[PDB]
């Protein structure tokens, strides 16, 4: 776990970009919009 | 080669290629009113000189981590790779910590650096790493050796942060070289001698003035003028000096003749600025020109030695002392001398 | 211990209460069935 963790702090970048980073803000915005799309058949596979 | 002992002044520099420019950003701290530290402008020091007295820190202890641990759950050595260092600031004399709140929303992982009183905690230490594959740990630390600090509590980086404003260092996960550059190597400091960036004054021999600026009573304007004057003036906060060396590195060494340096008034914070117009005045640091605002001390009248001395990486030689040191301002540029006026006309002699 | 503090302290740091809170308190629909491929 403690390894683990150290990995992940070093790479920030396996976090999701919603959640980690300078742009998306948090989980609560990451998963309204990943229900949002889900509802939205034009951003899947036609 | 040198290496990095303890009880020692240094500088912790860093290098931004912002806006396709590179830039020497250093780590300074206010320490007096607020806690959090922020960015000095080490570089463009030719017309705005940067304010070395307050990003000088001091290493006091370097132990392992197994040390560490061991004496928070309970000398002149050598700086070791994978220690752990403690930052006090020389001029507050709080130790750098990283601290809990965040300040720039642009992270909203990351942590802010500043100054704290006690030494209790993980937040207070800094563990050492290289930033190059060619040393290892356990390997003597030297002077020019890119260096990567990580907290001991946090377990991130000492990060430099972008922004338009926000150009604050945090603690992040993306690490950032930093460049160490020593001032006083803590070794026998000359007592009586005089040191680079030390806070002194002058007087006569058989006058018994000191060189200053008139008191708050009046305007900065009139502040802004340079006079002798004698009496409780001796022992006042608007008569002592600064010699601030052009020097990022070393500029806390024995000061040797000729030497160029500014001469700044800890009251004002002004630099003594010469246009040729006029005498010498005060002026701030948005528009200290070298040339302008350097100046020299001499032995002599004459001008036997001008540019002799050019560059010593190092201690240097106790040459200058205190009480029989009799030195002469001299200017870069004119290279005029001092001379006491009579400005004050008879009709107003007996008065100040 | 002291580093399980730490690694907890990391997690709390890296991932907000209320961004928790507010994504448990989303109350999904209960649907003639439907399709489960979502929330």
Not at chain 2, 145 to 174: C, K, M, P, T
Not at chain 2, 263 to 269: A, I, S
Request: net charge negative.
């Amino acid at each position: 776990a403690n390894v683990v963790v150290r990995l992940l702090i070093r790479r920030p970048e396996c976090f999701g970009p919603a959640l980690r980073g300078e742009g998306g803000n948090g989980l609560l915005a990451a998963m309204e919009e990943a229900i949002k799309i889900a509802e939205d058949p034009s951003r899947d596979g036609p | 080669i040198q290496f990095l002992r303890t009880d020692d002044e240094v500088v912790l520099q860093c290098t931004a290629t912002i806006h396709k420019e590179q830039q020497k950003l250093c780590l300074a701290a206010e320490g007096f009113g607020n806690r959090l530290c922020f960015l000095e402008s080490t570089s463009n020091s030719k017309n705005v000189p940067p304010d070395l007295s307050i990003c000088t820190f001091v290493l006091e202890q370097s132990l392992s981590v197994r040390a560490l641990q061991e004496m928070l759950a309970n000398g002149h050595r050598t700086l070791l790779y994978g220690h752990a260092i403690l930052l006090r600031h020389s001029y507050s004399g709080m130790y750098l910590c990283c601290l809990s709140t965040s300040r720039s929303s642009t992270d909203k992982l990351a942590f802010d650096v500043g100054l704290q009183e006690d030494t209790t905690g993980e937040a207070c230490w800094w563990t050492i790493h290289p930033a190059s594959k060619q040393r290892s740990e356990g390997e003597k630390v030297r002077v020019g050796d890119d260096l990567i600090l990580v907290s001991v509590s946090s377990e991130r980086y000492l990060h430099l942060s972008y922004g338009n404003s926000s150009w604050h260092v945090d603690a992040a996960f993306q690490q950032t070289l930093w460049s160490v550059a020593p001032i006083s190597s803590g070794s026998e400091a000359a007592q009586g001698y005089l040191i680079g960036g030390d806070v002194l004054r002058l007087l006569h021999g058989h006058m018994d003035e000191c060189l200053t600026v008139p008191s708050g009573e009046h305007g900065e304007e009139q502040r802004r003028t340079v006079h002798y004057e004698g009496g409780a003036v001796s022992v006042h906060a608007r008569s002592l000096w600064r010699l601030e060396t052009l020097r990022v590195a070393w500029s806390g060494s024995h000061i040797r003749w000729g030497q160029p340096f500014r001469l700044r008034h800890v009251t004002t914070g002004k630099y003594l600025s010469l246009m040729e117009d006029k005498n010498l005045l005060l002026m701030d640091k948005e528009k200290a020109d070298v040339k302008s605002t350097a100046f020299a001390f001499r032995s002599s009248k004459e001008k036997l030695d001008v540019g002799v001395r050019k560059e010593v990486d190092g201690m240097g030689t106790s040459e200058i002392k205190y009480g029989d040191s009799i030195c002469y301002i001299q200017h870069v540029d004119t290279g005029l001398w001092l001379t006491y006026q009579a400005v004050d006309v008879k009709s107003a002699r007996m008065g100040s | 211990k002291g580093e399980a503090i730490r690694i907890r302290s990391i997690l709390r740091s890296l991932i907000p209460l209320g961004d928790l809170v507010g994504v448990i308190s989303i109350a999904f629909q209960m649907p003639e069935p439907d399709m489960s491929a979502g929330f």
